[PDB]
Amino acid sequence: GSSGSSGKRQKIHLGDRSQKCSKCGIIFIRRSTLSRRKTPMCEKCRKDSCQEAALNKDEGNESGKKTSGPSSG
Ligand SMILES: [Zn+2]
């Protein structure tokens, strides 16, 4: 550990995409998502979609978002 040449390796990009949530009001990065609600919700809130009615959670089903090409083999 020692002071060397001025910091060169810099990979800092702009930060606009960042959107302010409406439910909680946290700062997050809006990413590709299937338009469902007409409001800026952060990943955190999104999870609380309030859909899971039954106490159960998952009995052998891994919810996967649309991906390039179907799933076959
Ligand atoms: Zn939120």
Swiss-Prot record:
Source superkingdom: Eukaryota
Subcellular locations according to the entry: Nucleus
Chain's role: May be involved in transcriptional regulation.
Family: Belongs to the krueppel C2H2-type zinc-finger protein family.
Protein name: Zinc finger protein 483
Organism, as annotated: Homo sapiens (Human)
Whole-protein residues included: 379 to 438 of 744
